[PDB]
Structure 1
Amino acid sequence: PTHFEKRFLKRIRDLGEGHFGKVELCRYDPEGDNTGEQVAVKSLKNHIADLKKEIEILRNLYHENIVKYKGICTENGIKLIMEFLPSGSLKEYLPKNKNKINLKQQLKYAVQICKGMDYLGSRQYVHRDLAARNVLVESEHQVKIGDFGLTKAIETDKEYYTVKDDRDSPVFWYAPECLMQSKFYIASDVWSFGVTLHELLTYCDSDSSPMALFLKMIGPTHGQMTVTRLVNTLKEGKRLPCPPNCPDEVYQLMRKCWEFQPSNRTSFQNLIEGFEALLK
């Protein structure tokens, strides 16, 4: 049930790619009649230790708005087997469905992301990579958090996890404590959600992305100096602007995600209630 043989994993196309990881669409067809189910397969281009930790996290997560763990494919090597969501990420889905997805549907997606994130927090995890590119579309009515590559477990009686590695990170979705001290709280994921909500409301328009907006604020910056300028911009109280046609009530909840201090930010449960109060 949870074990998948490499020989039966029939590669169809690439779904996503990171620095050391890749996700491919496969058809697990043990009968050899092309009737088996389509699955998402996470493999490596040590990073094995990380992938094993990611497998363990996803195996332990079971929620309507969290990509379903299916099993593993062992080669020393290992592959993570997940369900395949045919519509892909919000980053790809939203620019192609601008006339289909109205504000009501975007708020239903925000509720769904927050429910998935609240459950993640209840398990004492910090995602650290909440962006539209990691929110997958099951159908026009449902989304799921679909990647856990940077997810860490907060130790019991601790409020945050401290990152100790040399890995790359989505700095444009990061809260000040992440940027300044490499500290990741549940309140750090709330900040990233705020940024993800901004993307969702702009229909993931490339010219309106956090990197594009912040880079037009900051200017020519260089990989070394990006973080210090970003921190300086945030310290000055600058934030991503209200997307076009975003009502004030929605932008107010977004601003509650961007309080400089983690202890002053809204919770995911307060966000759920807040968005549901707006859905009629």
Structure 2
Amino acid sequence: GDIVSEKKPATEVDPTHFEKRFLKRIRDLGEGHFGKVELCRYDPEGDNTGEQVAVKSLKHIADLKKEIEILRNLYHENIVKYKGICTGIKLIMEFLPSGSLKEYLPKNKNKINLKQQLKYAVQICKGMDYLGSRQYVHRDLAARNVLVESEHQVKIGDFGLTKAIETDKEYYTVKDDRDSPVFWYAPECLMQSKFYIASDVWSFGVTLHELLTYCDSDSSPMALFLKMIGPTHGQMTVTRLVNTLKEGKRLPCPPNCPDEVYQLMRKCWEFQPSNRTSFQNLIEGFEALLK
């Protein structure tokens, strides 16, 4: 008889599925090593009216898929929104036009006083506490990974190194560590590549320092540390860092930072993880300073 085709089923539209043919690149937002994030417009009508989105791709497939599964199931006002995927696979996120603290703080000093800084600090802590409650370690908390939604709101905006801590275990052991942000890392991470929730508290301390210096490049943790230890030690750098930290030396108080803010910061940097403050205690500390 007649050619037998297949009865077409009712094709619903998934709002989390972005078609590659309509995803149009505008510019690069950031990158390094294995992955990159690009600003695109998803423009299915082809008239330049479509939504702008942040697209994370690979320059490692399984890592990105894990990252996508983590972000997709995180819901918090201080965590960047998952929008969908393009399938190889690309992670589609909301685009925050003010960028990260790295871009925004140098340009908005007149706008952002100590009060607004402590409010960001509180919001970064709330996000991180949420992540910790879901049994995750972030491993990459730095100002460049903190996005500005508005003058009054920040969100944690990249989860590429985030790992799950096994239930009834205190830490995660890392193998791939070539490209570690060592000037943000707690001693136990540098020495044994173990990562506690308290190690994120340490990194938070260093992120708070960056906030307080408005992410000035000449006051960056890397810059300040390389002054403390020496900028020309090559592969001996990390060991000299570990050594300086053992001796009890820490980043200095930022200019115009009240001692009471600086002490909250120093509690992030107790050498022993069990001696460090928690995110909830940081929150309480900042809120007491705020009112």
> CA 1:223/1:62 → structure 2, altered by over 3 Å: closer, same or farther?
farther
Deviation at 1:166, TM superposition (A): 4.6
Deviation at 1:253, TM superposition (A): 0.4
Could you report, residue by residue, the CA deviation over 1:56-79 in whole angstroms, capped at 9, with x for unpaired residues?
Answer: 1101211100000111000xx110
Deviation at 1:268, TM superposition (A): 0.4
Bigger mean CA deviation after superposition, 63-72 or 27-36: 27-36
Deviation at 1:179, TM superposition (A): 0.4
Deviation at 1:276, TM superposition (A): 0.7
Deviation at 1:92, TM superposition (A): 1.0
Find the aligned partners of 2:253 and 2:16 in 1 and give their Cα distance. Answer: 45
Find the aligned partners of 1:18 and 1:59 in 2 and give their Cα distance. Answer: 22
Could you report, residue by residue, the CA deviation over 1:64-110 in whole angstroms, capped at 9, with x for unpaired residues?
Answer: 00000111000xx1100000000001011111111110000000000
| Structure 1 runs, 4 residues or longer, greater than 3 Å off | 220-223
Could you report, residue by residue, the CA deviation over 1:100-140 in whole angstroms, capped at 9, with x for unpaired residues?
Answer: 10000000000000000000000000000000000000111
Could you report, residue by residue, the CA deviation over 1:29-76 in whole angstroms, capped at 9, with x for unpaired residues?
Answer: 11222221110000111x1111111101101211100000111000xx
> TM-score, normalization: structure 1?
0.97
Find the aligned partners of 1:140 and 1:166 in 2 and give their Cα distance. Answer: 35
User: 2:191 maps to what in 1?
Assistant: 180
SS in structure 1 of the partner of residue 183 of structure 2? helix
Find the aligned partners of 1:35 and 1:235 in 2 and give their Cα distance. Answer: 55
Find the aligned partners of 2:232 and 2:242 in 1 and give their Cα distance. Answer: 13
Find the aligned partners of 1:114 and 1:120 in 2 and give their Cα distance. Answer: 10
SS in structure 2 of the partner of residue 10 of structure 1? strand
Deviation at 1:167, TM superposition (A): 3.6
User: 2:80 maps to what in 1?
Assistant: 67
Could you report, residue by residue, the CA deviation over 1:259-279 in whole angstroms, capped at 9, with x for unpaired residues?
Answer: 000001000011111101111
Deviation at 1:220, TM superposition (A): 3.3
SS in structure 2 of the partner of residue 66 of structure 1? coil
SS in structure 1 of the partner of residue 28 of structure 2? strand
Find the aligned partners of 1:153 and 1:224 in 2 and give their Cα distance. Answer: 30
SS in structure 1 of the partner of residue 91 of structure 2? strand
SS in structure 2 of the partner of residue 203 of structure 1? coil
Deviation at 1:221, TM superposition (A): 3.6
Q: CA RMSD in A?
A: 0.9
Q: Bigger radius of gyration, 1 or 2? A: 2
Deviation at 1:222, TM superposition (A): 3.8
Deviation at 1:162, TM superposition (A): 0.3
Find the aligned partners of 1:256 and 1:166 in 2 and give their Cα distance. Answer: 26
Q: 5+ unaligned residues in a row in structure 1: which ranges? A: none
Could you report, residue by residue, the CA deviation over 1:143-190 in whole angstroms, capped at 9, with x for unpaired residues?
Answer: 000000110000000000000125411000000000000000000000
**Residue 52 (structure 2) pairs with residue 41 (structure 1):** no
Find the aligned partners of 2:178 and 2:149 in 1 and give their Cα distance. Answer: 30
